[PDB]
């Protein structure tokens, strides 16, 4: 389908205990490929996907530098927020950004974004025209005025529309053998009594990539979603994802119920029964 590169910064202050912590994670689609964690005597941008071995060694030095500088500005930003919101120096607070670009399967750009949060709430966001801002409150309006006066939106649009897209295409090629092979789910259903009258059927989908999936129970061929328990998609730990959907049924009625598994690595949707 489409593809994305996404970055997520987290900055957390710790009054009394030294400098804020600062973490970057970077994703292509549903696979993390880099990390930066300031909690080291000499922190480095580090690979988190093996195809990242294909970059030039300067990449790590250059990305490490940018991570370190970004950590410094977020330590200033944390302090600035204390002034904007008239908060004391005593408590720990959080800054976050996320940004990325999206691309069709053919590599054509179609969406970029950039958003900021303070203490877990929207702070300021780049609008979808990528030329204007939405401030969540009067505190953030300070930042909106600042960034409008300084034409920051254009620097954001420059990166999101060009270098973001170019690098995304380069990583997709770099990691084609994994990034672009969809692992289909390995599915199966299990049987566990509820009453002596009732039993629960659970439909498992394991080991699939990417993360988007459709797991539904049908009774007599029509969808049953007001009686299905459906856990959130969860990581396997090896880069694959997991999900299950369950439904309680009267005894004997098992052949009425079917499980429909739709996923991009499946030539056609799977149908399973007990």
């Amino acid at each position: 389908g489409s593809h994305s590169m996404r970055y997520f910064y987290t900055s957390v202050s710790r009054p009394g205990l030294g400098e804020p912590r600062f973490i970057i994670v970077g994703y292509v689609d549903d696979t993390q490929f880099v990390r930066f964690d300031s909690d080291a005597a000499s922190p480095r941008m580090e690979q988190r996907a093996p195809w990242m071995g294909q970059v030039e060694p300067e990449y790590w030095d250059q990305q490490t530098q940018i991570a370190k500088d970004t950590a410094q500005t977020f330590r200033v930003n944390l302090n600035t927020a204390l002034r904007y919101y008239n908060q004391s120096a005593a408590g720990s607070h959080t800054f976050q950004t996320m940004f990325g670009c999206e691309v069709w399967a053919d590599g054509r750009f179609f969406h970029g974004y950039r958003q900021y949060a303070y203490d877990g709430a929207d702070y300021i966001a780049l609008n979808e025209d990528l030329r204007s801002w939405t401030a969540a409150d009067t505190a953030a309006q300070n930042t909106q005025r600042k960034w409008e006066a300084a034409g920051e939106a254009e620097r954001h649009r420059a990166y999101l529309e060009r270098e973001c897209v170019e690098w995304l295409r380069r990583y997709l090629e770099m990691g084609k053998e994994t990034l672009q092979r969809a692992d289909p789910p390995k599915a199966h259903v299990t049987h566990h009594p509820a009453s002596d009258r009732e039993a629960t059927l659970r439909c498992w989908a394991l080991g699939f990539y990417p993360a988007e999936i459709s797991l539904t129970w049908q009774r007599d061929g029509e969808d049953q979603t007001q009686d299905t328990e459906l856990v959130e998609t969860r990581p396997g730990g090896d880069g694959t994802f997991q999900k299950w959907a369950a439904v309680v049924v009267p005894s004997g009625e098992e052949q009425r119920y079917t499980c429909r598994v739709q996923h991009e690595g499946l030539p056609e949707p799977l149908t399973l029964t007990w």
Partner: peptide, 9 residues
């Protein structure tokens, strides 16, 4: 990759 450039709130 990231590019240089910093944004102070």
């Amino acid at each position: 990759a990231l590019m240089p450039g910093q944004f102070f709130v």
